[PDB]
């Protein structure tokens, strides 16, 4: 069209103007040095204008730019023609990327449905390698492989997909090899795949735990791939030493089940699998033991006591065979509720008139008289909240109430002086008949006329546990997470967990009972004349023990005076996710808290302290540190380059230790100041240490999103800004030191060779590698194609390069071309690579589809092995050209794509991937680099080839068909191999040779009387020499 021809004329005009302006910028390999108006084939201008005449013939004919620019005079590669072809081709693809991007990103694909069919109604211009991608809804985008498509982009999906999943699709459109050229299509509606077959994912067990000696709880949420709607579950509990297995089919709505009637101290195996309409899925297994059998002490051996509470009396009775009965307090009015303390020994009373009286006691005797403690409600009350029920928080020392306003019923918390009222929960209409606080698990349970409830201590999670008509006395086990509730009208006795899902009736012995207590498996039951200890299956006519009562006709509450009624200790402690970051003399160790049960709220007791064990591995000596208040610790005064073994455990408020963590093995750095250099995305540079502390904000200010900076010498550095710009800063004195005035577009990475004294970068526009002298600014085009990242070995001069597909080595001759890795582009691309010189190794990162893989290879020409070191399966990936080698640690270091963390993999221990946090004044980071402690060595004079003398160029005597031109053999200081690039200028035609000999075996000369111009360019693998231009007549 007419829009296409303007793009072709603009790209061709910009290409010809680019060959005009850059005609003196590059030194050619043969030392050409044309004038500004010569118009001969040797020059930069004619070959570069040959590059801009064959860029559109190379796209339509679909030939490479190296295949299109194939000259017999310049063999094997013509650098200005190939370079002008690739900048003109990526200028064309950049203009076609901006020409279509609104119509690409505004029109949206539609799914129609037999195989799955995507319809994408785009009308592309006639002026003109698409990829279809998929993403799992509730990740990263993965490349789809099997698709058959029409030319109108109605695309049929032939890849077999996972059933009963949601899939969102898009069209990735790559304009040309450049990654930026890719334009993404908009998002699709999520598609339910039709379900078939068995499930392929196991259920995920969140909390599997033992409640007591005869109960065992499991909580789970379903796994990711279900392949149908859930019809139910299959739970199979099997003993390790036993022949009785219990199978239970639990339906789809339940995510918790509690096994009952088990055995004590038996370490159980639970099989958990999904059930759908088509089959049964895989089995997830977990290992737990039940608790030990609690001691059924006989009726002769009982040293505990009970509190027997009437309407008008509080009575103390010891549980001895000789029963001691004493009257603690007698009131002239009726009581409503009490509270009690085990360690403070305080016993608050609340009457029917709503006056709160406090009292203290020991051994059934009153040691402090009953003072009246009034409630200072303050701004919380709206007036006349007279109290009805009462309970006590034994951890936060709070009194929890339930009042009455004549209008509504409200639970508050107040202090032991009544000074701090906090309204908890919302108002409700039914009266509380019993109020209990679970202080250890952070719950409060109350019971009304029709039901039983559950709040936490701040009122956040309100749950109704049970609906039953007229419930009686309920008692709370905090250690076993079971509420035992008596039903007096129905005559049974019922056993409820804290979520309310597990209920179980128990045999109540027949008399009505209006209170109970639970001593072991036995049941303390009051009457009007006696208190009996019955073991839950026996009759009331034959108890295990009996205690007579005289002055208590009515007894609505029995409170057992044990410390297990009000515990301090959660009795389960296991710290997890132990991590450690290490320096030379110090370590930064972070773990997490022990995890919360489903029967524990956010107001639970989380008062654990920690003990960390540090084991020296080489000497087997352990020092143990204690009383760590928090989930982090910083170790100090360690030994450098030593392996340490680290375990941690939790110590509860009682001081009872928990179970040790599975050990982490980690090694300190070697001794020395090891300075890590950071660069923020704003452009600021700080210098930290091994641990990320000791920050020094440097004076230099870089450009936005910089890469790693390559030293040439101690003033001048070169870095690649992340839009593609290559910069140059003198850190010391800024008005001199840098040969380039402007930044350079379309540069991938940059390296420096210290021996040749040459800066190497990848020109992504020219698809080649540019070698540049930093003292002068003369550039040299090198025939290394499609390279993104470079490295050079200084011992022999091999250039190691990374394509997005391959990783290879460029030598002086093409016999030395060794390719180390190849990957398909749908599988992934190489993210960065590191050449190791001292141990003769290579490392590279491969950015996969949802994965990050790390590899290793030697530097031999015949490769011995190739080891995949470590794989990270996640959406978080690396910054490209950010892999660094830590040669003191023996480790690899890369920066993650978010820029707020970095990953370290040690070569001795690859499984432990250390996380190092980015410091706060450079907190979005784009570069991380370990500084070399030694300075850079200067330029070797033993790699510079000497100039061939102009009087030494002579012709040997021979015929006209076979001439021989010879010269003095150029050498260097170190005796390296010196090769020669040669130019023959006779008549109009030209002839170029590459030689490894100081003579030239010359043929195909036409005749005699020929004036013959000779150019000698000596070179080594690091650096080319000056050009010797003589004039010789045959
Ligand atoms: C670091 O290297 C730079 C070149 O990259 C050196 O600067 C050159 O030094 C001479 C001597 O004064 C100047 O006349 C040149 O103009 C500089 N070259 C360029 C290209 O600008 C510099 O000497 C080095 N610095 C140190 C401290 O060694
Ligand atoms: C429970 O039994 C399994 C073997 O079936 C064993 O691996 C596990 O350690 C046992 N748990 C204990 C002893 O706590
Ligand atoms: C190079 O060879 C010469 C001639 O034998 C010798 O004197 C010199 O030491 C050699 N230099 C090196 C660096 O090997």
From Swiss-Prot:
Glycosylation: residue positions: 243, 267, 379, 713, 975
LDL-receptor class B repeat residue intervals: 757-800
Disulfide bonds listed in the record: none
Subcellular location: Cell membrane
Subunit structure: May form a complex with drk and Sos. Binds the phosphotyrosine interaction domain (PID) of Dab.
Protein purpose: Receptor for an extracellular signal required to instruct a cell to differentiate into an R7 photoreceptor. The ligand for sev is the boss (bride of sevenless) protein on the surface of the neighboring R8 cell.
Protein known as: Protein sevenless
Source species of the chain: Drosophila melanogaster
Gene: sev
Residue range from the parent sequence: 206 to 1287 of 2554
